[PDB]
Design a protein around this ligand. Structure first.
Ligand code: CA
Ligand code: CA
Ligand code: CA
Ligand code: CA
Lengths: 73, 72
């Protein structure tokens, strides 16, 4: 219980820190921009983004982000 | 403040990824987070190798943020 609770808190913390524009989603441009700051190349950034953006609308919701963890409960 | 706020963001991302509170992103905990996010293991390992510049199996904050820190 507490372990899963902590992991959800952890995922939200990562998501929120990534979400520089405070939209509640990870838009493509801000995701790319962070990857670039971390020196990850655009093809890798896009590979990871296209994967997370399940519905291909150009922004990763927290549902999409934590799909794997939430589906595992 | 713009830069200071970016540093805080990078520090927050890093802290959240360091689940075992080692001060570093060990390959194991890094990969496990990527597995959790449903990221393909080859994409995960590529991003880990990119960050782990000295190739010791753990990402320091100096390594993680070297692009930001060195552009200051
Ligand atoms: Ca956003
Ligand atoms: Ca989406
Ligand atoms: Ca660690
Ligand atoms: Ca290292």
């Amino acid at each position: 219980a507490d372990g899963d609770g902590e992991e959800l808190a952890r995922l939200r913390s990562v998501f929120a820190a990534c979400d520089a524009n405070r939209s509640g989603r990870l838009e493509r441009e801000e995701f790319r921009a962070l990857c670039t700051e971390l020196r990850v190349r655009p093809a890798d950034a896009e590979a990871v983004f296209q994967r997370l953006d399940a519905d291909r609308d150009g922004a990763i919701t927290f549902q999409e982000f934590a799909r794997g963890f939430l589906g595992s409960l």
